[PDB]
Design a protein around this nucleic acid. Structure first.
Ligand SMILES: [Mg+2]
Lengths: 184, 56, 144, 67
RNA sequence: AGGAUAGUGGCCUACCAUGGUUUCAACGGGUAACGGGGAAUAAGGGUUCGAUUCCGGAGAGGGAGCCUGAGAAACGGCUACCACAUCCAAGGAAGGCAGCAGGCGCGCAAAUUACCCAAUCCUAAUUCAGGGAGGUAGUGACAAUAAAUAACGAUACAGGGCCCAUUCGGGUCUUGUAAUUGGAAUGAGUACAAUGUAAAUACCUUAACGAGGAACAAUUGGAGGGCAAGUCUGGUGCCAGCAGCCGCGGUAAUUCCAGCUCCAAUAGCGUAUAUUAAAGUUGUUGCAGUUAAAAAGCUCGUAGUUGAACUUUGGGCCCGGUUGGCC
RNA sequence: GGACUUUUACUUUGAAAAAAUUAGAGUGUUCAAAGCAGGCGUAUUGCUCGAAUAUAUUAGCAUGGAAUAAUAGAAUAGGACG
């Protein structure tokens, strides 16, 4: 006897379990973007399908329909805001066929690589997990963050961390103390 | 059908097989790192191309 | 006119005619008749516990030559005698006698699995120690 | 760190409006010594049976205690 | 017409009339049936499920009866009967966990005899008291969200352009590997402290301590086809066993038992049962009926379904809106 | 306020169809499932946008239409205007 908590699942497995085309295609996304799972890939296919479903049904509606206008621009604006939808594509038809890995490009793990500082996608992921990232002034350790194309310029190293200052580090302290303690 | 038989041979081949122990090997990266290991070996390296891209 | 009535006021004829031809389906007839409840010695449940009565050396259907090493188990909730397969390589040695076993179907939904004549269930546990795990020496059968 | 704060016009309103749990967290008031909840319930159910003060019954059983 | 009811009413009584429902499925039987809001899967249509966080019913072991009160056929109220069962110094007395914990049975199947009224709100004569309602904590891989098991330099091999085009020399630059070497980075886990909360345990912070493999070690399933992943080695030899289906096993087994290698999902994976899609194999959308299953032997014939055409049409007059359209 | 008003089916629109749930708008749970928060200042006095909307078989009610498919009208004329 209490208000239930709404909860939904965010992925869906493919119909065919074993085919060379999909298995080789997914592994391309894993290495190119540093993903630990196929569930990491199935998640976007779930969100992309839901976005595609909404645009598919809104396009069947006649033009200038108040529902199509309100939800169409809201869906375009939200996609444009995170950068997955380019500015010149706002016709509610490019939403349908963007890409599988257009959303995968805005992931903070692969977004760190674009703004240097990792020189590998794997390095970018562990830097995120090891708290050495601050999208704004607040630390994030989630590889999938979907930068809003406005916080992209603010993605710098974590101020309260090594590579940001104020501490030489954990093991570097042991090394530094080793020289100091053995100097005499 | 007939229900009788001979239970004296139960597990006959399980016992006769010789015992061979796990060959020790360095442990394999698990998780995201294994995705790198799979990516580079089969999409960058072409070593196992024996006749039909035979990896085994 | 292709059989079926097409009038706009003929929903009763279409609705009734579907019901009478629903009984031709094996699954629909079985579910509504409730044969699983009144037969199929389980109570319509996934697993059922029983007591091993004897050990069997059931043959194999042609073309095949093997001894299938089944057991005669009597269910507790019903008291009916069923034949249960002991699936692994030589695990009949773990089911000696009077062992409370946990049974399960063969995945063929009431039909015999393979060349084994007239069996529908397999043993899953003996005294509740995961009969598969015994074959992999991950546990040990209790003394009592 | 983000939190909620309250400030009063004086300490007279502070003690009369703040709950006891927060006041004892601040030292303004002392925590009352209380037994366990189950013991109080068992005590409440025990003395429900006796009717009245029970002093008359207390000495009556004392007379029965002799024999 | 009268009684009864808080009231209408065969609700009941007296007299009178023979009426009332039904193939448009009455009545009877079954339900492994509380009803809905809703859930699962779905191109569209649909199929299955709903004991269970909300609403409305009914019940307090089975029945019946009743006091109190505005409100009960009340059961953490009473009375009687039946069935269970408690203590008795044998005359007697006292019971209803389908309330919260907890126990026995039943089973394939489901948790602590913990803390508290601090929040939500309820009750009383009422700011205070009470509240197993409710909240907090414990067990909890029922289900869901996120996400650890590693990252980066230089030496040594193996590639691609290119500088020289002075043989086969060095290689400016990239991509992998080494019983090559190096310093970085952080969390699980300990914990001063603070925060947390009614008091705590946790969370978010944080003194300090906290990677190097033999370690801080990832599993579950498979490798004939469906369905990518072995004709690799040893064992067995129609025996043991595998195998959802087709099949494998009779001394060269890519299918059994093991080792090596490879593959799929991955803190999850397998199995059994039920259900949905697949299923245009229930077909309104949308099946089939000469020979694969299926046109009644033939005709009449009610209910049902369906049923020819036709009745104010055309032309003008204006007024006022929406999309454009150079402006 | 008055006299009659041929009756249906169908369709448009509107009110109704509890909340939660489904879809969906906005927004820092660090992302996400969630939740309905939150945001902005001289932070010393305070200011302020939200918590929409969509969906909701069929039955019942009101309104426009009047094609489509029915129904009745004046024929051994108490037929209508008066
Ligand atoms: Mg007829």
């Amino acid at each position: 006897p209490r208000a239930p908590r709404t909860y939904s699942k965010t992925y869906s497995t493919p119909k065919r379990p074993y085919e060379s085309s999909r298995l080789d295609a997914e592994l391309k996304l894993a290495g190119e973007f540093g993903l630990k799972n196929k569930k990491e890939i199935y998640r976007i296919s779930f969100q992309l399908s839901k976005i595609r479903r909404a645009a598919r049904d809104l396009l069947t509606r006649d033009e200038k329909d108040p529902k199509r206008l309100f939800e169409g621009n809201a869906l375009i604006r939200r996609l444009v805001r995170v950068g997955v939808l380019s500015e010149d594509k706002k016709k509610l038809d490019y939403v349908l066929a963007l890409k599988v890995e257009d959303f995968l490009e805005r992931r903070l793990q692969t977004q760190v690589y674009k703004l240097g500082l990792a020189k590998s996608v794997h390095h970018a992921r562990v830097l995120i997990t090891q708290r050495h990232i601050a999208v704004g002034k607040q630390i994030v350790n989630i590889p999938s963050f979907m930068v809003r194309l406005d916080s992209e310029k603010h993605i710098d190293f974590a101020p309260t961390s090594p590579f940001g200052g104020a501490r030489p580090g954990r093991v570097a302290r042991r090394n530094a103390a080793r020289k100091a303690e053995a100097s005499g | 059908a007939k229900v009788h038989g001979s239970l004296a041979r139960a597990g006959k081949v399980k016992s006769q097989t010789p015992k061979v122990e796990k060959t020790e090997k360095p442990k394999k990266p698990k998780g995201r790192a294994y995705k790198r290991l799979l990516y580079t070996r089969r999409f960058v390296n072409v070593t196992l191309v024996n006749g039909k891209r035979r990896m085994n | 006119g292709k059989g079926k009535p097409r009038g706009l006021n003929s929903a009763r004829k279409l609705r009734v005619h579907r019901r009478n031809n629903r009984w031709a389906e094996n699954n629909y007839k079985k579910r509504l008749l409730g044969t699983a409840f009144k037969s199929s010695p389980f109570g319509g449940s996934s697993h059922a516990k029983g007591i091993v009565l004897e050990k069997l050396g059931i043959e194999s259907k042609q073309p095949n030559s093997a001894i299938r090493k089944c057991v005669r188990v009597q269910l507790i909730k019903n008291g009916k005698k069923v034949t249960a397969f002991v699936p692994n390589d030589g695990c009949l040695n773990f089911v000696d006698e009077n062992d409370e076993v946990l049974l399960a179907g063969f995945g063929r939904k009431g039909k015999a699995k393979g060349d084994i004549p007239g069996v529908r269930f397999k043993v899953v546990k003996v005294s509740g120690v995961s009969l598969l795990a015994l074959w992999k020496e991950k546990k040990e059968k209790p003394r009592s | 760190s983000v939190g909620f704060g309250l400030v009063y016009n004086s300490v007279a309103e502070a003690k009369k409006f703040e709950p006891t749990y927060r006041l004892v967290r601040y030292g303004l008031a002392e925590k009352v010594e209380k037994a366990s909840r189950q013991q109080r319930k068992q005590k409440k159910n025990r003395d429900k049976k006796i009717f009245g003060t029970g002093k008359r019954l207390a000495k009556k059983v004392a007379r029965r205690n002799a024999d």
